[PDB]
Design an enzyme around this catalytic site. Sequence first.
Site, PDB file in Angstrom:
ATOM      1  N   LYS A  36       0.829  -1.198   0.000  1.00 25.51           N
ATOM      2  CA  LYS A  36       0.000   0.000   0.000  1.00 25.51           C
ATOM      3  C   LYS A  36       0.869   1.256   0.000  1.00 25.51           C
ATOM      4  O   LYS A  36       2.085   1.186   0.200  1.00 25.51           O
ATOM      5  CB  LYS A  36      -0.904   0.015   1.236  1.00 25.51           C
ATOM      6  CG  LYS A  36      -0.140  -0.122   2.545  1.00 25.51           C
ATOM      7  CD  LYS A  36      -0.303   1.114   3.414  1.00 25.51           C
ATOM      8  CE  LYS A  36      -0.411   0.751   4.888  1.00 25.51           C
ATOM      9  NZ  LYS A  36      -0.733  -0.691   5.033  1.00 25.51           N
ATOM     10  N   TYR A 268      15.608  30.625   6.394  1.00 23.74           N
ATOM     11  CA  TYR A 268      14.499  31.339   7.013  1.00 23.74           C
ATOM     12  C   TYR A 268      14.651  31.500   8.521  1.00 23.74           C
ATOM     13  O   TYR A 268      15.111  30.587   9.215  1.00 23.74           O
ATOM     14  CB  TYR A 268      13.179  30.622   6.707  1.00 23.74           C
ATOM     15  CG  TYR A 268      12.840  30.596   5.237  1.00 23.74           C
ATOM     16  CD1 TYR A 268      12.961  31.751   4.452  1.00 23.74           C
ATOM     17  CD2 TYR A 268      12.419  29.416   4.617  1.00 23.74           C
ATOM     18  CE1 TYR A 268      12.679  31.731   3.095  1.00 23.74           C
ATOM     19  CE2 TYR A 268      12.133  29.389   3.254  1.00 23.74           C
ATOM     20  CZ  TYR A 268      12.267  30.550   2.501  1.00 23.74           C
ATOM     21  OH  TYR A 268      12.011  30.530   1.152  1.00 23.74           O
TER      22      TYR A 268
HETATM   23  C1  LIG Z   1      12.924  31.933  -4.619  1.00 17.69           C
HETATM   24  C2  LIG Z   1      11.472  32.016  -4.206  1.00 17.69           C
HETATM   25  N1  LIG Z   1      10.604  32.972  -4.748  1.00 17.69           N
HETATM   26  C3  LIG Z   1       9.311  33.099  -4.405  1.00 17.69           C
HETATM   27  C4  LIG Z   1       8.789  32.288  -3.498  1.00 17.69           C
HETATM   28  C5  LIG Z   1       7.312  32.473  -3.170  1.00 17.69           C
HETATM   29  O1  LIG Z   1       7.165  32.900  -1.810  1.00 17.69           O
HETATM   30  P1  LIG Z   1       5.827  32.826  -0.959  1.00 17.69           P
HETATM   31  O2  LIG Z   1       5.277  31.476  -1.099  1.00 17.69           O
HETATM   32  O3  LIG Z   1       6.196  33.119   0.418  1.00 17.69           O
HETATM   33  O4  LIG Z   1       4.942  33.843  -1.526  1.00 17.69           O
HETATM   34  C6  LIG Z   1       9.594  31.289  -2.881  1.00 17.69           C
HETATM   35  C7  LIG Z   1       9.035  30.504  -1.739  1.00 17.69           C
HETATM   36  N2  LIG Z   1       9.583  29.112  -1.641  1.00 17.69           N
HETATM   37  C8  LIG Z   1       9.342  28.418  -0.456  1.00 17.69           C
HETATM   38  C9  LIG Z   1       8.152  28.259   0.210  1.00 17.69           C
HETATM   39  O5  LIG Z   1       8.426  27.769   1.440  1.00 17.69           O
HETATM   40  N3  LIG Z   1       9.791  27.611   1.568  1.00 17.69           N
HETATM   41  C10 LIG Z   1      10.356  27.999   0.451  1.00 17.69           C
HETATM   42  O6  LIG Z   1      11.690  28.041   0.207  1.00 17.69           O
HETATM   43  C11 LIG Z   1      10.960  31.162  -3.267  1.00 17.69           C
HETATM   44  O7  LIG Z   1      11.751  30.227  -2.722  1.00 17.69           O
HETATM   45  C1  LIG Z   2      -4.014  -3.744   8.533  1.00 19.55           C
HETATM   46  C2  LIG Z   2      -2.516  -3.730   8.312  1.00 19.55           C
HETATM   47  N1  LIG Z   2      -1.783  -4.920   8.174  1.00 19.55           N
HETATM   48  C3  LIG Z   2      -0.458  -4.972   7.962  1.00 19.55           C
HETATM   49  C4  LIG Z   2       0.233  -3.849   7.874  1.00 19.55           C
HETATM   50  C5  LIG Z   2       1.726  -3.982   7.636  1.00 19.55           C
HETATM   51  O1  LIG Z   2       2.458  -3.544   8.783  1.00 19.55           O
HETATM   52  P1  LIG Z   2       4.035  -3.354   8.801  1.00 19.55           P
HETATM   53  O2  LIG Z   2       4.349  -2.322   7.812  1.00 19.55           O
HETATM   54  O3  LIG Z   2       4.399  -2.949  10.155  1.00 19.55           O
HETATM   55  O4  LIG Z   2       4.605  -4.651   8.443  1.00 19.55           O
HETATM   56  C6  LIG Z   2      -0.420  -2.585   8.000  1.00 19.55           C
HETATM   57  C7  LIG Z   2       0.342  -1.309   7.851  1.00 19.55           C
HETATM   58  N2  LIG Z   2       0.147  -0.447   9.066  1.00 19.55           N
HETATM   59  C8  LIG Z   2       0.627   0.861   9.054  1.00 19.55           C
HETATM   60  C9  LIG Z   2       1.937   1.265   9.045  1.00 19.55           C
HETATM   61  O5  LIG Z   2       1.991   2.540   9.486  1.00 19.55           O
HETATM   62  N3  LIG Z   2       0.714   2.962   9.782  1.00 19.55           N
HETATM   63  C10 LIG Z   2      -0.113   1.980   9.531  1.00 19.55           C
HETATM   64  O6  LIG Z   2      -1.460   2.015   9.701  1.00 19.55           O
HETATM   65  C11 LIG Z   2      -1.823  -2.548   8.229  1.00 19.55           C
HETATM   66  O7  LIG Z   2      -2.452  -1.372   8.391  1.00 19.55           O
END
Ligand SMILES: Cc1ncc(COP(=O)(O)O)c(CN[C@@H]2CONC2=O)c1O
Ligand SMILES: Cc1ncc(COP(=O)(O)O)c(CN[C@@H]2CONC2=O)c1O
Lengths: 382, 383
Positions: A36, A268
Amino acid sequence: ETPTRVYAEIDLDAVRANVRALRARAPRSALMAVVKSNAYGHGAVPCARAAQEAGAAWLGTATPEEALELRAAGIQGRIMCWLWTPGGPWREAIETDIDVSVSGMWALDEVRAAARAAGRTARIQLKADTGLGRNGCQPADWAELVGAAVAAQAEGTVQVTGVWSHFACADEPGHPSIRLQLDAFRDMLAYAEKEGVDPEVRHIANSPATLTLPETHFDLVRTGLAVYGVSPSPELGTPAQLGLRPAMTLRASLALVKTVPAGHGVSYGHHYVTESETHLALVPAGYADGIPRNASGRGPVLVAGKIRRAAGRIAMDQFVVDLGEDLAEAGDEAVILGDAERGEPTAEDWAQAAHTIAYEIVTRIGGRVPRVYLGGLEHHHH
Amino acid sequence: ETPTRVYAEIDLDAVRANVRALRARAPRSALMAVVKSNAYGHGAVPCARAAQEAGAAWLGTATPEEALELRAAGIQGRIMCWLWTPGGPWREAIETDIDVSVSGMWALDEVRAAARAAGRTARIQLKADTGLGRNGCQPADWAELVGAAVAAQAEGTVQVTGVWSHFACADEPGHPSIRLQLDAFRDMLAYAEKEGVDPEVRHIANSPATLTLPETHFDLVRTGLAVYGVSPSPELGTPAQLGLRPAMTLRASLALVKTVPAGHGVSYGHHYVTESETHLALVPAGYADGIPRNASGRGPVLVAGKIRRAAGRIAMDQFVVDLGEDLAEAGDEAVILGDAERGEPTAEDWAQAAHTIAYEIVTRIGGRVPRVYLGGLEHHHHH
Ligand SMILES: Cc1ncc(COP(=O)(O)O)c(CN[C@@H]2CONC2=O)c1O
Ligand SMILES: Cc1ncc(COP(=O)(O)O)c(CN[C@@H]2CONC2=O)c1O
Ligand SMILES: [Cl-]
């Protein structure tokens, strides 16, 4: 060709080896490779083909869509899915011969009708809520659902192929709830088996239970994580000690390396300030690509022969590292996570850095990241 | 027909409204809609198309692959991408008329060779590191980079169309780093101009800088988050206060509802135990879909008319909510995140619960989650 920014390298040979090693752990039971969530981020189909190849008898997914995609890919054999919502593609599932889980009457009624329309019998497995309190039927409603199921079986509309449950603390070696659920499961199974249900398979174990409690094996074990070479928890041990091999290696190429004076802020909020004139490297992978932002200032990365740490806040598409006196250049390889046997950071290392579990790390690797397969058979790469 | 498990409904009218609202904020500058990371999880093509028709004169993406997906979808106009690594598709970007960013000498030389192979002039934008310490040319290397560019210009290999930077703390009103960077930008920009660069565009403002410091608008403003109706920070106020309309609404259908005895454990680790006999509901969405595991026990969801908190550990494909005495049934709707005006939990609400920022909440909504598009023009949601 080979992604120049970042990409997820999937070793289908590690996968196959892990399933062989897991089969050996539970010699008397059948193996269900749970694929899954895009096979926990490794690629559903390729990994499902490889798993079946190494000897997996069953394939399991959460949603019907996921299961139908496996059939559409030409995969044969038993497949089971369990996360249903009213109005799902029951009929489609029945026609493709997919085992469906039933937890409540609403589910049973929808599968019975779909069976009629399809003019075919549905293979259903009854899920008991032995303590997890998630999906599944509660002990109080068990007698009723069981009765309705044997009734529908008589009407030739369904065929109860399984009775199963799921653990809540199987990854905590020794937790008292474990034995409690094992007993509750044994008791609810008997009541069902006494009311007219002859199950094809009996199962309750996941990866952790499989790796530690042979009394939980029964006819089938559902292994997800372990298949990908990651250990469910550190209390169970490392993949190495578990005999598992990590299937995914996340790699990226440096986009920039420059020198900065002392007292220069990084990223940031300027939560990181250089201590002295140093060299900084830009890793072009961010939280949009699956690098957790909560790993800011702690995320380990392998650059220029040494382990580096994320410097300051991790951004949407990139994050920097302080190489200090060490030198490197744009295009140089950076290993974000991979194999501990090769001296690289691991899925567990990042889980600890981001205050989460290894399950989330590999599974949340973004769609913007291309996957590259190696090992296994050529057709596995599709 | 319509997702029976979980799905993201994207309101294209909210998008058009926001870019329209954003333009009114920077009247004397062009607006660049940043649609990288699949439009912050909203859908790159439909959103790029919508913002364009709403007035965005430029489009911005992080990677070349993202910019080339836009071109492939028939989107025309000015587009810029800035995250490049050695071996990128320089030739392909140049040929599709996309503006590329150069922060080092390695890039400049790769684009020159690429431009020659394409038999065309590349439009490159010079990035200056005025304090972020991320990408961009360090002040002490500006002189050299600006020198190599004006040279490549004379050879007809490239044309420097822009000069720009990016703020580190524009989302923290009144931060000293802001003025520090603005000053640096003007100073570095001036040098570039004096040595021969005539930029088509000068820009440094992001969403928070655009909404607060009008002296940062310059020729162009690059807005990302605000275009989707989410505030860069609680410090700047709510979307409603900023006059923004949230574009995404994440809904799910209960998979089960059952009564459980008092003192019953819930989910992995049993971090939640019912205080009494109660009704539990299973929400079929988990961290693989984008619901942060870090919101375990705190993430809000609207069910049966009331806000409920995630009961215990959030799992990979689902999580549970305790309804107490209230009743609901499988198939009923649950709103994970939406419009506070509709009385629903929001992106910020979840940012708080998961100890992160709204930017990461909307962006990491998984691919397993289908997107449904409302409003805008019909042909917009074709991709
Ligand atoms: C180079 C650059 N320009 C413009 C933007 C747009 O900015 P806002 O989403 O704040 O308007 C981002 C944001 N990039 C992201 C967003 O979160 N972290 C980052 O580095 C950026 O990295
Ligand atoms: C019903 C069921 N059976 C088997 C598995 C397999 O488990 P393992 O990955 O540990 O072998 C999962 C995954 N369960 C997950 C894993 O993380 N969150 C969940 O709900 C499950 O939800
Ligand atoms: Cl360089």
